[PDB]
Amino acid sequence: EFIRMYFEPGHYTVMENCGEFEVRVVRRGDISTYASVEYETQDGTASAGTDFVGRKGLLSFPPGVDEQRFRIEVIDDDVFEEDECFYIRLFNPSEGVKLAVPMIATVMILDD
């Protein structure tokens, strides 16, 4: 491998009423060709369908581009909740790419 991919930022703290927030994944090393990686949300103490909307996707990095950004929807309610967390993981990197820490992003939702 001559390409590494990882979340940057690796950690996101978001308010419950933010609507959506943006996650960023970076590529380091060989720029010069197309590369890709998949991601998927996963529950922590926060859960898809109650606290955020579950999402999986494919991130495409054209030649010359070293980052991709995607949005995640946070579900707002009126009920008081303690700080809760969910995660987003990278998987299935394209040929010649190796994931690097952090390859799981942490998301903490703060209640409003």
Write out the binding residues for Ca(2+). Answer: 16, 51, 76-77, 79, 81, 84, 111-112
Backbone angles phi, psi at 81, to 5 degrees: -140, 150
In the chain, the amino acid numbered 7 is F
Instruction: In whole angstroms, give the CA distance from residue 95 to residue 77.
Output: 42
DSSP 83: -
12 to 51: interface string for Ca ion, x by CB under 5 A:
----x-----------------------------------
**Position of tokens 């690097």?**
100
80 to 99: interface string for Ca ion, x by CB under 5 A:
-x------------------
* Contacting residue, 40, 43, 66, 76, with Ca ion by CB under 5 A: 76
Looking at the chain, how many residues does it have? 112
Instruction: In whole angstroms, give the CA distance from residue 45 to residue 82.
Output: 10
Q: Per CB under 5 A, which region of 21-29, 45-53, 79-87, 89-97 contacts Ca ion?
A: 79-87
Binding positions for Ca ion, rule: CB under 5 A: 16, 76-77, 79, 81, 111-112
